[PDB]
Amino acid sequence: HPGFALTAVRTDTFEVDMLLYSGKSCTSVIINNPIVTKEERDISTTYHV
Amino acid sequence: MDARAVAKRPRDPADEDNELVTALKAKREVNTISVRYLYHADHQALTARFFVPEGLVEFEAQPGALLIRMETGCDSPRHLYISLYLLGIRASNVSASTRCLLESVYTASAARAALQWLDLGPHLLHRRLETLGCVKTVSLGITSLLTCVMRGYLYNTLKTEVFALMIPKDMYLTWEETRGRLQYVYLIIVYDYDGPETRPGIYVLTSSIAHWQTLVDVARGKFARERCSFVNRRITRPRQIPLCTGVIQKLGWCLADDIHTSFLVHKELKLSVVRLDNFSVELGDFREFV
Amino acid sequence: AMEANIFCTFDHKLSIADVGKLTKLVAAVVPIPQRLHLIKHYQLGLHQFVDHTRGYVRLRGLLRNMTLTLMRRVEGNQILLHVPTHGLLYTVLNTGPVTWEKGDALCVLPPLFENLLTLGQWELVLPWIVPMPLALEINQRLLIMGLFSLDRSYEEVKAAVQQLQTITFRDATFTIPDPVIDQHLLIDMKTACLSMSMVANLASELTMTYVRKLALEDSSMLLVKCQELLMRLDRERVSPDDEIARLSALFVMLRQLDDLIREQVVFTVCDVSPDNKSATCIFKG
Amino acid sequence: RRGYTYPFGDRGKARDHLAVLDRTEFDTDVRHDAEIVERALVSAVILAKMSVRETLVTAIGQTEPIAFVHLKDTEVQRIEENLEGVR
Amino acid sequence: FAATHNPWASQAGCLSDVLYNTRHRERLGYNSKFYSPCAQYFNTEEIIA
Amino acid sequence: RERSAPKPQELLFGPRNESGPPAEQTWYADVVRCVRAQVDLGVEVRAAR
Amino acid sequence: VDRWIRHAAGVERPQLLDTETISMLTFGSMSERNAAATVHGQKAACELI
């Protein structure tokens, strides 16, 4: 035994299934019609909604 | 191959139904998506998306910054993207006041590390920097996205507004009295071969001179001291092999009335800029002169 | 609405596997020697230019003369090719050995290396798509190892040539072909090297005479120290018509050398796929 | 200097032997010079052998002997006669 | 209610403080990618924030 | 002045590195002119290398 | 002493493209190699104070 001890610290990551409660009309969500924008590239054309 | 067929005027989107409209109308089907007008579907500018860490995003939330990609001798982050401002702290031209200002702003691991990677390598700057376009977006985060264009104007998604190009004043350079109806904007880097650390000077030029030969002759006439020092270091400190007293890169065309002097604010710090309110990008790689 | 494409015809009948193989390169850069609407498959690629006496230098000159054209679509009996107009962005395939990063300024190089579409008499040899810094590096390395041809007998020359031959560029290591074959140097390489040697040699002689006169005039004070420099190197060790002929010859040799001196940027990259074989880029000069 | 300029097969091996050769300078003590001169010479001979592709012994516990490289035998014979005279 | 149960860890500059505070670790040359359980307890600048 | 070149982490993190001397030096000089016997002694003068 | 301690602790010398790689490392990198097989999961890195 050397002249000094030591305290070790450790972390373990657990996997968990949560449950969430919410009250009726706790929030109101505001949305519009989805909107599409075009990125033009020759071989493949992409559209962002 | 007929009289009626050849006489036809070309087909244009505002009157011809968009492709998704064609498909849905032909099936007689509906989507929840509102898809009649496609945004970005009439843009002439060619854009790209870049990711950068938060430390380098200073002074970049303002559209109109000029963006640079620089080489690093490492492997996994090997290319970082830096702004012309961060390039200014190293510029041995810019005055002490502006230098201390943007040194006070650019205080993070990422930007400072960009500075050591610039100061470390034996290569000259122009053999380490590749130029990108001018930026117009900001999407914040620990790693942020920037949208950059290098061919054309610089404007909002609806083209509701045009974003200027912003130059820091101590880099702004002029060589002519009577302003031309059209002027090009060039980037110039020049090297001081005096002292142990060859001090690089950074310029953004504006001139009506389109031709390469007369432009380079005027530049060499105005940069006499650096050429003298190039020949001097050739003579006095041999078997070190300098090349280039400077390089010139072309990106832009603006009308003289569009350019104005302006201020720039960030974190209530006050930086002075020269602005080109309407501006278009056309990038060409460097050319070297001695 | 529509675009002006170029049609290409293959004469040798194509097995279904081979026309499938055609699709696998449906976005690569296929050079063409001329602008015309319907061309025969012999014209595609660089095989017609492959003369085994002439190497990399002549082929890069020709590639500067060539017209680059993206393969666009594949159908039976005829292939669609697309000539890229300036400024527009296009999708290209990475055929060369090296990977790409955003913002890379690309060039074209002659083939330096399974052969594509080995028809009975023909082979499809695409150019190398390379970033410009490696273009400078490889051109210089090949050029220098061209210089050492006359004294390859001594061991240290062989070791230096080996050191110049191996090239690394962003995690890619590959060996370029030696421009010396059977101790004989290909005529194009020999002419280029001789021209560079003569340019330097004749500059040495002419510059002293023509500087010492100009030094009298120079208010920009650099020509006097230029004369000082040329005298410094001088310390390290004639008819007028012949003199004007010598100047003319100096510029002739300089003109013959221009292919090694400057090359154009043809593509520059905007984004690259995780499928790294392909990337989008805009078309330069 | 010559080794740093010379085009070796791989930079690592020649660089290491040249580095142990580079920082070998003396120390104002008589006894230690006898060790360090030999210690420099062995590395120098390693480097010279690698330069001209003659072999070097990689056996553990064996050091490549201190000797010339590719001199003609008359020169080294007169060297050894001079060394006897120095004895 | 003792002053400290581990003098080598609680003091403002002791062994564990310089070893595990992210700031003192930045004064040294660490590698940021490695998680350290102590950093949660010791980064006193963030704790004060 | 007796400072070794900074280790990389010192330059990446923390308060700035600095340069020792200012670009301008402060000097005093004695000026003697012989053509008219005259000496200038109380001179404050600036010097730069 | 360094070699003796490294062989006692069992760790290899730092080999790297020293300067630029070390600046990158101080910026952050994944240096620790994987184990060949891990029937038990992620390494519970213990820290000692």
mmCIF file of N, CA, C and O in Angstrom, chain E residues 6 9 15-16 19-20 25 29-38 42, chain G residues 22 24-33 42 44-49:
data_model
loop_
_atom_site.group_PDB
_atom_site.id
_atom_site.type_symbol
_atom_site.label_atom_id
_atom_site.label_comp_id
_atom_site.label_asym_id
_atom_site.label_seq_id
_atom_site.Cartn_x
_atom_site.Cartn_y
_atom_site.Cartn_z
ATOM 1 N N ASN E 6 -11.658 16.076 2.105
ATOM 2 C CA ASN E 6 -10.561 15.698 1.215
ATOM 3 C C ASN E 6 -9.817 16.963 0.829
ATOM 4 O O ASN E 6 -10.172 17.640 -0.144
ATOM 5 N N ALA E 9 -8.709 17.646 -2.832
ATOM 6 C CA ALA E 9 -9.719 17.733 -3.877
ATOM 7 C C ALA E 9 -10.611 18.960 -3.789
ATOM 8 O O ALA E 9 -11.126 19.397 -4.818
ATOM 9 N N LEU E 15 -4.661 19.410 -6.234
ATOM 10 C CA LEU E 15 -4.461 18.366 -7.233
ATOM 11 C C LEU E 15 -5.688 18.120 -8.103
ATOM 12 O O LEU E 15 -5.637 18.255 -9.331
ATOM 13 N N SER E 16 -6.802 17.746 -7.478
ATOM 14 C CA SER E 16 -7.962 17.339 -8.256
ATOM 15 C C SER E 16 -8.586 18.516 -8.990
ATOM 16 O O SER E 16 -9.151 18.336 -10.072
ATOM 17 N N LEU E 19 -6.545 19.046 -11.994
ATOM 18 C CA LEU E 19 -6.564 17.856 -12.834
ATOM 19 C C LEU E 19 -7.898 17.696 -13.558
ATOM 20 O O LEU E 19 -7.952 17.117 -14.647
ATOM 21 N N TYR E 20 -8.992 18.175 -12.960
ATOM 22 C CA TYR E 20 -10.311 17.865 -13.505
ATOM 23 C C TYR E 20 -11.143 19.078 -13.917
ATOM 24 O O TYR E 20 -12.120 18.908 -14.653
ATOM 25 N N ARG E 25 -7.545 22.140 -17.083
ATOM 26 C CA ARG E 25 -7.229 21.164 -18.119
ATOM 27 C C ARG E 25 -6.946 21.847 -19.455
ATOM 28 O O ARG E 25 -6.116 21.363 -20.233
ATOM 29 N N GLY E 29 -2.674 20.350 -21.821
ATOM 30 C CA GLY E 29 -3.123 19.869 -23.111
ATOM 31 C C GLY E 29 -4.024 18.650 -23.133
ATOM 32 O O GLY E 29 -3.547 17.571 -23.501
ATOM 33 N N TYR E 30 -5.296 18.766 -22.751
ATOM 34 C CA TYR E 30 -6.087 17.544 -22.751
ATOM 35 C C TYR E 30 -6.583 17.246 -24.167
ATOM 36 O O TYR E 30 -6.264 17.953 -25.129
ATOM 37 N N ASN E 31 -7.356 16.169 -24.289
ATOM 38 C CA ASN E 31 -8.142 15.903 -25.486
ATOM 39 C C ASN E 31 -9.617 16.014 -25.115
ATOM 40 O O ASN E 31 -10.100 15.286 -24.240
ATOM 41 N N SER E 32 -10.329 16.912 -25.799
ATOM 42 C CA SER E 32 -11.679 17.267 -25.385
ATOM 43 C C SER E 32 -12.670 16.135 -25.588
ATOM 44 O O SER E 32 -13.723 16.109 -24.939
ATOM 45 N N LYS E 33 -12.359 15.192 -26.470
ATOM 46 C CA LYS E 33 -13.348 14.203 -26.863
ATOM 47 C C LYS E 33 -13.660 13.214 -25.746
ATOM 48 O O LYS E 33 -14.711 12.566 -25.788
ATOM 49 N N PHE E 34 -12.789 13.090 -24.747
ATOM 50 C CA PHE E 34 -12.982 12.111 -23.686
ATOM 51 C C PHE E 34 -13.837 12.688 -22.567
ATOM 52 O O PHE E 34 -13.509 13.731 -21.997
ATOM 53 N N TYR E 35 -14.926 11.997 -22.250
ATOM 54 C CA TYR E 35 -15.739 12.359 -21.102
ATOM 55 C C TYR E 35 -15.009 12.012 -19.812
ATOM 56 O O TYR E 35 -14.300 11.008 -19.725
ATOM 57 N N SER E 36 -15.187 12.861 -18.797
ATOM 58 C CA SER E 36 -14.606 12.628 -17.486
ATOM 59 C C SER E 36 -15.699 12.854 -16.448
ATOM 60 O O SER E 36 -16.266 13.959 -16.380
ATOM 61 N N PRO E 37 -16.027 11.840 -15.645
ATOM 62 C CA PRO E 37 -17.081 12.014 -14.629
ATOM 63 C C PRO E 37 -16.823 13.149 -13.652
ATOM 64 O O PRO E 37 -17.777 13.786 -13.196
ATOM 65 N N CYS E 38 -15.559 13.410 -13.308
ATOM 66 C CA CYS E 38 -15.260 14.473 -12.352
ATOM 67 C C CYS E 38 -15.600 15.849 -12.903
ATOM 68 O O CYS E 38 -15.923 16.758 -12.131
ATOM 69 N N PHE E 42 -16.558 19.492 -10.921
ATOM 70 C CA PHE E 42 -15.410 20.355 -10.681
ATOM 71 C C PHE E 42 -15.394 21.631 -11.511
ATOM 72 O O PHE E 42 -14.683 22.572 -11.143
ATOM 73 N N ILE G 22 -1.405 17.780 -33.328
ATOM 74 C CA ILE G 22 -1.632 18.087 -31.920
ATOM 75 C C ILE G 22 -2.554 19.290 -31.771
ATOM 76 O O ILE G 22 -3.342 19.354 -30.821
ATOM 77 N N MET G 24 -5.011 19.887 -33.890
ATOM 78 C CA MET G 24 -6.286 19.217 -34.128
ATOM 79 C C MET G 24 -6.752 18.453 -32.893
ATOM 80 O O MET G 24 -7.941 18.469 -32.553
ATOM 81 N N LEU G 25 -5.830 17.766 -32.219
ATOM 82 C CA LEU G 25 -6.177 16.990 -31.034
ATOM 83 C C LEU G 25 -6.671 17.888 -29.913
ATOM 84 O O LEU G 25 -7.681 17.588 -29.267
ATOM 85 N N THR G 26 -5.963 18.992 -29.659
ATOM 86 C CA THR G 26 -6.435 19.957 -28.673
ATOM 87 C C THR G 26 -7.798 20.508 -29.065
ATOM 88 O O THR G 26 -8.597 20.872 -28.195
ATOM 89 N N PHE G 27 -8.093 20.555 -30.368
ATOM 90 C CA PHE G 27 -9.454 20.867 -30.794
ATOM 91 C C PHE G 27 -10.411 19.706 -30.517
ATOM 92 O O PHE G 27 -11.610 19.932 -30.322
ATOM 93 N N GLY G 28 -9.911 18.467 -30.489
ATOM 94 C CA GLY G 28 -10.726 17.317 -30.128
ATOM 95 C C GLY G 28 -10.708 16.171 -31.126
ATOM 96 O O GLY G 28 -11.001 16.378 -32.306
ATOM 97 N N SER G 29 -10.381 14.958 -30.676
ATOM 98 C CA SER G 29 -10.304 13.814 -31.578
ATOM 99 C C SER G 29 -10.481 12.511 -30.807
ATOM 100 O O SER G 29 -10.271 12.455 -29.593
ATOM 101 N N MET G 30 -10.850 11.456 -31.541
ATOM 102 C CA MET G 30 -11.104 10.128 -30.972
ATOM 103 C C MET G 30 -9.854 9.267 -31.135
ATOM 104 O O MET G 30 -9.641 8.606 -32.153
ATOM 105 N N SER G 31 -9.015 9.271 -30.099
ATOM 106 C CA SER G 31 -7.735 8.578 -30.198
ATOM 107 C C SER G 31 -7.789 7.147 -29.680
ATOM 108 O O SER G 31 -7.099 6.278 -30.224
ATOM 109 N N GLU G 32 -8.581 6.872 -28.644
ATOM 110 C CA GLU G 32 -8.523 5.566 -27.995
ATOM 111 C C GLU G 32 -9.114 4.495 -28.902
ATOM 112 O O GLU G 32 -10.275 4.589 -29.315
ATOM 113 N N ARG G 33 -8.319 3.472 -29.201
ATOM 114 C CA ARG G 33 -8.750 2.414 -30.099
ATOM 115 C C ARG G 33 -9.783 1.511 -29.433
ATOM 116 O O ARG G 33 -9.917 1.462 -28.207
ATOM 117 N N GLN G 42 -20.221 -0.646 -22.818
ATOM 118 C CA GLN G 42 -19.335 0.501 -22.935
ATOM 119 C C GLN G 42 -18.444 0.630 -21.704
ATOM 120 O O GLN G 42 -18.877 0.377 -20.577
ATOM 121 N N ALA G 44 -16.772 1.578 -18.563
ATOM 122 C CA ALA G 44 -17.073 2.442 -17.429
ATOM 123 C C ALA G 44 -15.814 3.150 -16.956
ATOM 124 O O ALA G 44 -15.220 2.762 -15.945
ATOM 125 N N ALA G 45 -15.398 4.183 -17.687
ATOM 126 C CA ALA G 45 -14.160 4.884 -17.374
ATOM 127 C C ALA G 45 -14.200 5.451 -15.964
ATOM 128 O O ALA G 45 -14.944 6.396 -15.686
ATOM 129 N N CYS G 46 -13.403 4.874 -15.070
ATOM 130 C CA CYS G 46 -13.328 5.371 -13.706
ATOM 131 C C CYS G 46 -12.237 6.424 -13.599
ATOM 132 O O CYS G 46 -11.165 6.294 -14.194
ATOM 133 N N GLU G 47 -12.518 7.479 -12.849
ATOM 134 C CA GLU G 47 -11.548 8.532 -12.602
ATOM 135 C C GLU G 47 -11.183 8.557 -11.129
ATOM 136 O O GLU G 47 -12.032 8.365 -10.255
ATOM 137 N N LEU G 48 -9.907 8.804 -10.863
ATOM 138 C CA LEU G 48 -9.357 8.750 -9.520
ATOM 139 C C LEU G 48 -9.060 10.162 -9.044
ATOM 140 O O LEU G 48 -8.442 10.948 -9.767
ATOM 141 N N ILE G 49 -9.511 10.481 -7.838
ATOM 142 C CA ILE G 49 -9.097 11.685 -7.133
ATOM 143 C C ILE G 49 -8.399 11.227 -5.859
ATOM 144 O O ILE G 49 -8.988 10.522 -5.030
#
